[PDB]
Design an enzyme around this catalytic site. Sequence first.
Site, PDB file in Angstrom:
ATOM      1  N   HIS A 108       0.532   6.005  -0.030  1.00 18.60           N
ATOM      2  CA  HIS A 108       1.853   5.773  -0.611  1.00 18.60           C
ATOM      3  C   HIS A 108       2.820   4.954   0.303  1.00 18.60           C
ATOM      4  CE1 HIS A 108       5.758   6.820  -2.654  1.00 18.60           C
ATOM      5  NE2 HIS A 108       5.000   6.709  -3.732  1.00 18.60           N
ATOM      6  N   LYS A 110       4.633   1.732   2.074  1.00 18.10           N
ATOM      7  CA  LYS A 110       4.995   0.378   1.698  1.00 18.10           C
ATOM      8  C   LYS A 110       5.465  -0.425   2.910  1.00 18.10           C
ATOM      9  CE  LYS A 110       6.745   3.382  -1.734  1.00 18.10           C
ATOM     10  NZ  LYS A 110       5.463   3.629  -2.368  1.00 18.10           N
ATOM     11  N   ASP A 115       2.571 -10.015  13.320  1.00 19.28           N
ATOM     12  CA  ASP A 115       2.240 -10.435  14.692  1.00 19.28           C
ATOM     13  C   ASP A 115       2.383  -9.313  15.709  1.00 19.28           C
ATOM     14  OD1 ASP A 115       1.738 -12.879  13.622  1.00 19.28           O
ATOM     15  OD2 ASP A 115       3.412 -13.913  14.601  1.00 19.28           O
TER      16      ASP A 115
END
Lengths: 164, 164
Positions: A108, A110, A115
Site C-alpha cells: 500500500h 506510494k 538517485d
Amino acid sequence: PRREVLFFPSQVTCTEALLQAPGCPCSLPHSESSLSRLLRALLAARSSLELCLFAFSSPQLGRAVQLLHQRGVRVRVITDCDYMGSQIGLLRKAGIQVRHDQDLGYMHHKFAIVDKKVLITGSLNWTTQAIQNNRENVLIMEDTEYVRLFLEEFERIWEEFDPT
Amino acid sequence: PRREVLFFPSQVTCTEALLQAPGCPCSLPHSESSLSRLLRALLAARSSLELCLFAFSSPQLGRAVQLLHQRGVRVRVITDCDYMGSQIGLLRKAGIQVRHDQDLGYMHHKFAIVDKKVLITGSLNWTTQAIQNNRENVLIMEDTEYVRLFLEEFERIWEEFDPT
Ligand SMILES: [Zn+2]
Ligand SMILES: [Zn+2]
C-alpha cells in the site's frame, strides 16, 4: 536541501514539452502544476529510481518513467497488483523489472526514491483519477535518513518478491 | 527535533496500559510497535489535534482520540465518508466535530497535526486491517514548514465542509 509538499487535485496544465511529445498550439495553461512538479522531480533522476506504488495507471507518469529507462536510469518497480495496455504492462514490455503483491491491498506504499538521494512519498496513488480529482499530498524530500530507511524497506520488499 | 518513520505491518503488542484500560496478565508482547509509537505520538497532544483521514475504523486509534477529547484537547476530524457503531460515529457522539466528503474517494489524505507542531502523515488508512496486514509508512515530523502548509490545507478543507 529540498523539502517540499505538493497538494492535489492538480491544476490541468500542458506537459507536452516536458514529456518530449514527438515533433505550443494546445489550449491548456502552460504553467506549473502539482503534476508538472512531480514529473520534474522524477525526470531529474540521472542514475536510479525505485518505485513502490499501490497503483500506477497515469499515462503522464508512465511516460516519464519510460523516458528515464531510455536515458539509462536503473528503474525498479514494486506494485500491489500484477495488472495482467496498462502502464505496468507497458513498462514491463520495455524491459523495466516489475515485481508485485497479491492484488489483495497488502502493498500500500506510494513512494519513489530518486538517485538514492530524494524521497517522493504521499497519499497519492498514481492514477489520472486521483491526480485530477482527489485531495492528496506528496512530499519531496532530500533527507538522508528518510532516504536510507525507505531504501532499506524497498530492498526488503524487492528481495521478498523475487520471482526466481 | 523529531523526524521518524514507522513501517507497517505492525507487530501485535499490548496497549492496555497506554489506552488506560479500565481497572499485565494478557499474552501479548509488552514492547513497542509501529502502532504503539503512533498511539504515543497522538497521546502527547496537550492542546490540539487535527485529523484528516480517508478512513478511520481502528478501535485502538479511536480510543486514543477519545482520551484526548476527554483531556480537553481541541479535536477536529475530517474524513471521506460520513460513516452513518463505527469509530467516527462514536467520536461524533462524544461531541467531537467531524466534517466530511461524498464517500466517493475524493478526500484521500491520511494525516494528523499534533499541537500545531508535529505532523503525522502516511500511506496508512487507520483501520485494523491495514495496520496489521499492509505494507505502509507513517512519517512523524516536527517540521515548521510542513506543519504550516498541512495546517493551511486542513483549514481550507475544514471551512469548505462547514455544514452551516
Ligand atoms: Zn500545450
Ligand atoms: Zn498485556
